[PDB]
Amino acid sequence: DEAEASKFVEEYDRTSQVVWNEYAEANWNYNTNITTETSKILLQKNMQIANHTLKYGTQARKFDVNQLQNTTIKRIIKKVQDLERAALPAQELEEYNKILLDMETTYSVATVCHPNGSCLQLEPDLTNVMATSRKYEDLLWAWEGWRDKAGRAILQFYPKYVELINQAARLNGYVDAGDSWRSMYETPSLEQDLERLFQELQPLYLNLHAYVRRALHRHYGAQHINLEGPIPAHLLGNMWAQTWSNIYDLVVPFPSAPSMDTTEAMLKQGWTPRRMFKEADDFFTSLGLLPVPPEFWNKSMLEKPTDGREVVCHASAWDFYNGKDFRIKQCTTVNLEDLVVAHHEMGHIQYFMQYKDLPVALREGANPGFHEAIGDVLALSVSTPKHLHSLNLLSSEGGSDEHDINFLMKMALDKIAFIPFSYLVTQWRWRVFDGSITKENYNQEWWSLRLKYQGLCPPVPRTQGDFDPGAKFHIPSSVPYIRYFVSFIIQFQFHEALCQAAGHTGPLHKCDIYQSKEAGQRLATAMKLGFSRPWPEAMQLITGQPNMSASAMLSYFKPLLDWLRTENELHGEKLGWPQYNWTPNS
Ligand SMILES: *[C@@H]1O[C@H](CO[C@@H]2O[C@@H](C)[C@@H](O)[C@@H](O)[C@@H]2O)[C@@H](O[C@@H]2O[C@H](CO)[C@@H](O[C@@H]3O[C@H](CO)[C@@H](O)[C@H](O)[C@@H]3O)[C@H](O)[C@H]2NC(C)=O)[C@H](O)[C@H]1NC(C)=O
Ligand SMILES: *[C@@H]1O[C@H](CO)[C@@H](O)[C@H](O)[C@H]1NC(C)=O
Ligand SMILES: [Cl-]
Ligand SMILES: [Cl-]
Ligand SMILES: [Zn+2]
Secondary structure: OHHHHHHHHHHHHHHHHHHHHHHHHHHHHHHOOOOHHHHHHHHHHHHHHHHHHHHHHHHHOOOOHHHOOOHHHHHHHHHHOOOHHHHOOHHHHHHHHHHHHHHHHHHHHOEEEOOOOOEEEHHHHHHHHHHHOOOHHHHHHHHHHHHHHHHHHHOOOHHHHHHHHHHHHHHOOOOOHHHHHHHHHOOOOHHHHHHHHHHHOHHHHHHHHHHHHHHHHHHHOOOOOOOOOOEEOOOOOOOOOOOOHHHHHHHOOOOOOOOOOHHHHHHHOOOOHHHHHHHHHHHHHHOOOOOOOHHHHHHOEOOOOOOOOOOOOOOEEEEOOOOOOEEEEOOOOOOHHHHHHHHHHHHHHHHHHHOOOOOHHHOOOOOHHHHHHHHHHHHHHHOOHHHHHHOOOOOOOOOOHHHHHHHHHHHHHHHHHHHHHHHHHHHHHHHHHOOOOOOOOHHHHHHHHHHHHHOEEOOOOOOOOOOHHHHOOOOOOOOOOHHHHHHHHHHHHHHHHHHHHOOOOOOHHHOOOOOOHHHHHHHHHHHOOOOOOOHHHHHHHHHOOOOOOOHHHHHHHHHHHHHHHHHHHHHOOOOOOOOOOOOOOO
């Protein structure tokens, strides 16, 4: 009865802390030191954690959950009934675990080489080419080269990955892996909700897209941009065209109001990765939120090692499930983009610290998007010309309506452009998992969706054997993407709420929440819930209402919408890409 179920949950929490902590240390050791030995130890620890998951999952499934009264225990038990990959028979489990490691390793160590020349890694070398080169053919070399080396090499693994991850899902009572993932949101309306939200951002995105396309035409030439077609995917300042702010220089609304070069300013002033994380730590504590522990500074990997070594560079935050040991692993570069990423990662660390006294089963965000949003919310304030001037990374840009529209454009290039991208990635993998896209059409459907949602085209026709989704980290790493779409919507809701909590008046985009304890309190109360309640409860605690809504994001960018509509109107832009079949001729 109730006593047996309460006891079970207590034993699960005790044992899980121990085994999860062991697994986390082995996983960290491989991620920060990719070798045969650390791979071997990780794959061994995979079997140890599966043994535990199987043991407790099997006992959990013997409880009739709806006979149980207490709702917190009902909830933990239902969750422990999901064995995830541990539902697989032993041979398939070992195969699956090896496939995942091989995909991660392949992505993380791929390089692109000039013939008889230097070989470039994604971080920082190719990322730097995409962000700074203004030459069509140099950008193409990097963009195609990365797909040829990373994308194509992932293809041999992906169909077996999909088979095994779906098999695990069905064994746990889902129809496929995507169903399994989406279930974390506990929102039956989720599909419709995401479509509605995507549609509300259309006026802003289509106008931003049309304006950017016009500027690219100006720079790259009339023979290379079709003003009524999709934009070549290598021209947007980012390897995946997911965020476009690195081409700010090409699209400045008011060039008479130029901004300080922020990378130059950071470097000349001796900014370092540690300083970047220290500044993030300060922002959190200014809100009354928790500082990271001394152990964090000892054990974190805040830059790429120099001791001849392979690591997974992609930025991540790590909970070691003992309530003390939290770490970030990031190949940090000294620039503004990575300052924002550092805040994002520190938001994950904050969430870990806030829910650390919950049972480990409930040590997650209210939904995964909440976990992604916390750091980004603070980074919105960090990004204001006010805050950046106070860091001496910008001159005084206060006052002018020119600098103001410029600032909004700079933010839009990341925040608005990302909405269709995150939607695309979500939809593609959804349809791979549900079987609507097979290995016969992985790449063709990727590009159909790239066109349909983002209005982008590949600069070079794709060929058989290309697997461009493989060249995006989250695909081989099997990290869900819907979280980021959700994050980008809700972070503006949170910003709007925290700003009114802090007593900001005037346009939302001028808000800076630095030092607001009232704002800190809203966040903390929500984060302390972890995964203990339906996510609308945490949304309510932060915002005073329970829905996901694009209205805050639209309010923030309202003055840019007006400016873009006027600008595009006078140039006669035809929004969208009615000439959707257009691709580059040369
Ligand atoms: C349903 O059950 C939950 C969970 O209860 C806890 O875990 C069980 C498996 C058993 O081990 C229980 O002995 C244990 O209480 C109940 O939620 C818990 O309620 C208590 C009492 O309100 C909360 O106590 C707080 O604890 C913090 C310190 O951690 C103090 O600072 C607070 O002042 C306060 O005393 C406890 O946090 C809470 N735990 C969780 C995980 O939610 C719940 O009350 C119960 N429902 C009903 C209707 O009885
Ligand atoms: C890297 O890996 C090996 C185990 O393969 C280990 O002996 C060594 O201590 C590790 N090096 C670092 C810098 O962690
Ligand atoms: Cl691509
Ligand atoms: Cl997700
Ligand atoms: Zn994140």
